[PDB]
Amino acid sequence: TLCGAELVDALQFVCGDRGFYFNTGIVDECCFRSCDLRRLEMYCAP
Amino acid sequence: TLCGAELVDALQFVCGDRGFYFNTGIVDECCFRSCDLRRLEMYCAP
Amino acid sequence: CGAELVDALQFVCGDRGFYFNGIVDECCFRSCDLRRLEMYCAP
Amino acid sequence: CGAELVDALQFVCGDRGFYFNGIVDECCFRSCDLRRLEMYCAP
Amino acid sequence: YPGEVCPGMDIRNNLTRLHELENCSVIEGHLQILLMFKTRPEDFRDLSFPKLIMITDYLLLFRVYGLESLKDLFPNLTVIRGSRLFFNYALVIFEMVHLKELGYNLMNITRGSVRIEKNNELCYLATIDWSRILDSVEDNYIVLNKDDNEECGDICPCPATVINGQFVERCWTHSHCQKVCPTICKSHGCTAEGLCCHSECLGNCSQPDDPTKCVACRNFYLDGRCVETCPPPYYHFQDWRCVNFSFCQDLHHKCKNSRRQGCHQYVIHNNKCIPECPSGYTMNSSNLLCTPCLGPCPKVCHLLEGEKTIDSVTSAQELRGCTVINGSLIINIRGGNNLAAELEANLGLIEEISGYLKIRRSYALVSLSFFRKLRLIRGETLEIGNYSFYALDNQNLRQLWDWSKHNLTITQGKLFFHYNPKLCLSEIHKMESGTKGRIALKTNGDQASCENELLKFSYIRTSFDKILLRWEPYWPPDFRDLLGFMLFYKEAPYQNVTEFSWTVVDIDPPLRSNDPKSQNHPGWLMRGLKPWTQYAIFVKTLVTFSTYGAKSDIIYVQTDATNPSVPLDPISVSNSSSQIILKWKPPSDPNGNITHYLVFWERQAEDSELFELDYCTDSQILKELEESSFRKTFEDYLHNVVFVPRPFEKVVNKESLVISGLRFTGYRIELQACNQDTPEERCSVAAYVSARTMPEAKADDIVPVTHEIFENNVVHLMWQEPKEPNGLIVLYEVSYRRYGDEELHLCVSRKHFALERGCRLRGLSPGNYSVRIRATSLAGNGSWTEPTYFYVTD
Amino acid sequence: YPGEVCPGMDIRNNLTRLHELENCSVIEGHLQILLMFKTRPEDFRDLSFPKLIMITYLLLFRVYGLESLKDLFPNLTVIRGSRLFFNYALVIFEMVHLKELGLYNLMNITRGSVRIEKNNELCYLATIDWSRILDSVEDNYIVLNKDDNEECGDICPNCPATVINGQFVERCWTHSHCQKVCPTICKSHGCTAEGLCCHSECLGNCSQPDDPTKCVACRNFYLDGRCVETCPPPYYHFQDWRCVNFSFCQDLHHKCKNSRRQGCHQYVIHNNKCIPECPSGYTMNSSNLLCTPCLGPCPKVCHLLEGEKTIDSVTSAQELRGCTVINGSLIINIRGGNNLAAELEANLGLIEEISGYLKIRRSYALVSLSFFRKLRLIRGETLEIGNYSFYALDNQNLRQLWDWSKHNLTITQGKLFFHYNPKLCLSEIHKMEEVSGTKGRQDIALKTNGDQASCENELLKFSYIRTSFDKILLRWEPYWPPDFRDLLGFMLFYKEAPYQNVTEFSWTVVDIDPPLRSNDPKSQNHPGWLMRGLKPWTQYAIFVKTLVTFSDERRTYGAKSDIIYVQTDATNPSVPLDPISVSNSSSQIILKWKPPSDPNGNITHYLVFWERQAEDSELFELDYCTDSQILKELEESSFRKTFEDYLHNVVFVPRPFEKVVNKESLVISGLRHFTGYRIELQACNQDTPEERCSVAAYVSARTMPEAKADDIVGPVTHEIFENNVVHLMWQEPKEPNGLIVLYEVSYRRYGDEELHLCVSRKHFALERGCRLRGLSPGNYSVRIRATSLAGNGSWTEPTYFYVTD
């Protein structure tokens, strides 16, 4: 389970040069329950 | 209300000799709730 | 100890009762209380 | 203090060794535990 | 504010987007910079934004790499208003990885707080004091930064202030200090010379006492200068700006033609530009001026989530002005910070909520009075278990609505009350709102005793050192339930003490008696108090709550005035030959206000040596209450089975005195302190001092010398004794000199003076002579006698 | 028992009824005396009942005028305690004018305890020993009376002393009697005045030692004329003390059959016992008074009145002994904190089918409900409010229910409930839920159970330990909850345990912050702690605990480590203290020492060194002639988690030496007669290799001197000079006592006076012996005595010489 500290590390390691998109939430989806690459990569910028 | 040593003292005062009869009682009907001369005198021996 | 017993007794019962029926020793046994001192001044 | 600090540090190190300075200042500031002395080994 | 304005912005990914901060000096929103990965310090060294002056809502920085300081990016960020907070704070800096110093010229944060946390390189934290930046410093929250590991050396380049009794200088970076201003200028601000700025300036101004020269405008800003209020042709925009009619008209037209979500059809109300004017006012477009209407039009917050979770200032502010709620409300305030004011300001107008109402883990709450106009809870969408009002683990909750006037109506649904340790059962029972017919008992009111019954004191003596206490007898419906009495007392300089430092003492119940007459009137005598100090006393019962118990109200009593104690630290010095100046400090050993001092001064003869000298338990109590119940159990069991049915001066308001009319002499002085003046005296044991006036050398002068010449080379000398000897003439100095010879001296002590009746020289050779005599005392030496000449026969 | 047998009786009101104790030596039941409200010490002065010898409880309550039982019951010997009153076999309550007990002839109370309470005149309570009266003294109760608020003069007159709290006090009954304390060898059999142990069939006292016929009270059983162990085969046991043949039991059964209102029983013989009713599985043929095993199942159904019975005492449970099918509800309301597991299991053990609900309302002393040993199925046909067939409340010390790895319980109808069970973990409650079959087919409070109990089901495991002297390091594998931020830190406890006697329920608590988290299953710098210091030989018990923030919708107990006993490695011991040189012979010294108070390791053998000391140079040379913990739980642990979670929600938008063994003394031989000696002693503990003893204990030693050591042998050779100077030479003693410092020379002219001269060792060497000067002419005599460090030896032989003018 990716929690409130390593979540940013995992998101960076997944997104890379993509960056983060902008313009309930992510903590319950990924910390209160397990997530996969599918979910984490979705938050990366397109 | 009558309870503890007050109960036996009042029973003695009410009976006025005549002894005590023999052959949920008292405490529930004289300490949990108030009583009168009617109930107490009934425990004295006839 | 018992001297302060006297220096409290003549205050609590200075008007009347500052005598004996003695109260020092058992006050170390049975503590000291206001109702434990007015009775001693009664006799 | 640094004296008992190293008198325990040499035991927790064995042959790993250490250098005396450092860890003394922080130990004077914060309580000590394995995490603060196992990293202080100087191979 | 020179330059233009720009809306709030959020910046991520690469750094080129930071160019969007081209020239705008005002941000009409929030500035967020986040997720700046794969960036090095060389990228941040060449980019600066000195034009930026003011940010309206808040500034957030999070996960920036390469950046070490804001000293380059924001050298002129004057004011963070704090109109719209982030969570509870107007400035948040979080998980800064390479930021080292915060980096100045920032004056005021009107509303909100600051949270800086999880910074592994930040220094220069304890150097700043937040009382001069924001108001509620207690609301601030900074923790576990690099500077919190006592490793940062903040070498200030800076005015110094005191916190918690320690005095330290305040600076921002290694090259800047904190631009502190004098208290007179306060929020108005001051220039470099300390001159207070104009009333419309906030923080600082280029030229003092000029609304046109304010760097940051308080109240409102119209054009080129800061004004207290917008002129009649102009209406208030966001709290900081004044705009004309055309500005709001253009905003409304833009929101109309462009279907941009998140914007509002702006209107004019009370000379202010408002996204939507409040309840009771309709709209018909036309002049863009909304007017009141007879038809009720309450503000309906049609929250699409179906429910809200109010855990922050911003969450409540999202419901600012709404009167009815088309959903549920959950209150989950945490952190222990007081939130009553903002919650009441934001949710005060709430009247009827369609959903339910929950209060879970609200640790900081103390009362639910925020819903000042809460009238009807519909309860149409109930929580599981069908509850319209839910309460859980509100550790500090004490009181619900004031039931004297508040009239609450519940349409349907049950109620829930669990784990409210400081909430009495009386409030819960009083709540049963019209819902009496249609609680976890031991978990409520645990630390807040529910002793509705009141005890009344009867007699007091209050002594120069103790006190009489006597209450009124109190017995539960069944005695032996009254284990004893809990008596609490504590010194109280002011009558502002609460129930929960207290000193407690145990008291056994009095021996009750039927036809009680006067009973024993249980009480207590205290074990010693400082007399003049006021004390607070209250008494509460202790019973097995199978009988709620009783508790006497707090009563403030102070003992009678006692005799004072010795004065402390006296000083005795002399300024003139007849006056001695005495100084002393108000003695703390005695109590009570010092009314007047008593000074006694006694003259002393000189020391006899000088005359004679020839110079020439929670577990523990649980056993007992179980034991007491067991003790009552057998007694009840037996009855069930066995009873079968059929010179002095007083100084007033001065800690110093100058005793005049004195003689040079050794002198004994006594000082007495009297804390009461109504009798002839209520004084203490005197403090002893000894002083001595300076010498009067003229008094030691001897007024020629009468002499006789004898044939045995002996010449007697006699002289007038000084009228006012300086203490004691210890000896007399006699100087004689033969004509043409060197001077000679002879010592004549007072014992020698009396033995020989003055002085007489011995072994004088024939010839002319000159003789003079000088007196010597404890003070010094007087003037010599007039020259006297005599001849010795050959 | 030389007397008559009468049943139990209750005496009240007028004292004439007390005369009914005419000749009753043994009572077949309780004896109660009550409400004698108009009686004075005059009335009780001349009434005595010495014939009574044995009581099967005895209760006295609210008797006025009576001062003591010293005359009322002078021969009451044994109170059995078959049927207790509440939990006690003797009760003395609210006795107003009672002054002393006076039951000096009371010996044993087999079953139960004693309670005297709320008296105001009795004395002599602290001077009676209950350990010699009844076995279980911890459950007695004497709380409030006279001689507890103001001591009496308890003048014991004869009275053996007994130790209590480490101090000995004499035990006495009255101002004229004292407790009979038989020796431990006699045990419960008793002894006479001479201390001879009675026969095994006697209890307490016996008329003549070693004779069942002379037992005052039979320990096991009583036959018509003699105390017996198990009664003769023709005689069955009855009331646990009598041996009765067919006649008595048959007559009792016939009398019960005759009386339709008497609360008697149809007695039946079974297993050589005449009992009111034989247990379940047996039925009576009504012909031979012998009940036989039944064919169809016939459980002992006990029809409870008013469908309910409350159990709060062993007397309440005893009314259900032998029952198997309860036709009603059941409430267990034990009070006082006294353990009642054994009696409850003995009485309610055979309970299988209960036709109602079971409720445990305020049972403070209960630890487990295992005493319902054969509780197969509860029916719940009669339910309380809320329709619960099983209720639990306020059970402060309740730890666990039935052992669910072995038990098998079935409930038919109704729900259950639980509340305020601080020592009951929720895991056992959920096991109860699933095992009974109630859940799913058809309650538990949120947080009221296991609040002060170790609910951490997860088990930690130690990894590496290194013990050395006063230091020990611990290290266990890392543990991380699903939300690693929940782990506040680690809780470490330790105690000094000489033996295995700790079960988590004194410790020293240490707080450890969690280690920094590291990805991968790689080494995460395994959490541990360094011990501050320990005794060099003590054994310690250590276990660690987790500290995690709880979530309302997410349970997380945490984890704990099993208690492990680790003893530190040994070091060198400490020096023994108080050695003394107890010299016994001229060459032997019995050194005596005692072990050090802190051996820090078992003593194996002392190391002994002794160094010879030359005498002092002065002798040779000189010429002598709780809010804060919940506070730290929320606003910087839970609050810090909220903002961090809130931020992520908003921003992430989806797209020479001797060894002495086992002996404190040593007799070193081969020593000098009187020479001073230096002794060194060290304690040793692990010297199978080269020695590792402690530092040396120092003592100066000196053997006994001998007179012959200082004795001068033979006469003294002499020389005569013309200047009235006589020089004499004598043999120096071979082995003087330590050192001869001077010589005493006595000289006397023949028949004339005697004179003495002092010669030092330096004078001895300078003049080569001694030289007498000024001797008068004529026949002369001289004798010499030697002085050593011990004293003076024998004088020389009489030496005679002549002096010439």
From Swiss-Prot, chains A, B:
It comes from the Eukaryota. Forms a ternary complex with IGFR1 and ITGAV:ITGB3. Forms a ternary complex with IGFR1 and ITGA6:ITGB4. Interacts with SH2D3C isoform 2. Forms a ternary complex with IGFBP3 and ALS. This is Insulin-like growth factor 1. Residues 1-23 are annotated as: B. Residues 25-45 are annotated as: A. Disulfide bonds join C3-C31, C15-C44, C30-C35. It comes from Homo sapiens. It is found in: Secreted. The insulin-like growth factors, isolated from plasma, are structurally and functionally related to insulin but have a much higher growth-promoting activity. May be a physiological regulator of [1-14C]-2-deoxy-D-glucose (2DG) transport and glycogen synthesis in osteoblasts. Stimulates glucose transport in bone-derived osteoblastic (PyMS) cells and is effective at much lower concentrations than insulin, not only regarding glycogen and DNA synthesis but also with regard to enhancing glucose uptake. May play a role in synapse maturation. Belongs to the insulin family. It is linked to Insulin-like growth factor I deficiency: An autosomal recessive disorder characterized by growth retardation, sensorineural deafness and intellectual disability.
From Swiss-Prot, chain F:
Changing V608F: In LEPRCH; impairs post-translational processing. The modification Phosphoserine is found at S363, S370. Changing N449D: In IRAN type A; uncertain significance. Coiled coil: none annotated. The record marks F37 as: Insulin-binding. Changing I116M: In LEPRCH; mild. Changing G356R: In LEPRCH; Verona-1. Residues 644-652 are annotated as: Insulin-binding. It comes from Homo sapiens. Changing G29R: In LEPRCH; Helmond; inhibits processing and transport. Changing L90Q: In LEPRCH; inhibits receptor processing. Residues 575-637, 712-805 form the Fibronectin type-III domain. Changing S694I: In RMS; impairs post-translational processing. Glycans are attached at residues 14, 23, 75, 108, 205, 245, 285, 327, 387, 408, 501, 584, 602, 779, 792. Changing F372V: In IRAN type A. Changing R242H: In IRAN type A; interferes with receptor processing. Residues 1-655, 656-805 are extracellular. This is Insulin receptor subunit alpha. Changing T796M: In LEPRCH; impaired receptor processing; impairs post-translational processing. Changing P183L: In Ins resistance; severe. Changing I27T: In LEPRCH; abolishes post-translational processing. Changing N13K: In RMS; impairs transport to the plasma membrane and reduces the affinity to bind insulin. Disulfide bonds join C6-C24, C123-C152, C156-C172, C159-C178, C182-C191, C186-C197, C198-C206, C202-C215, C218-C227, C231-C243, C249-C274, C256-C264, C278-C291, C294-C298, C302-C323, C425-C455, C625-C758, C684-C693. The modification Phosphotyrosine is found at Y364.
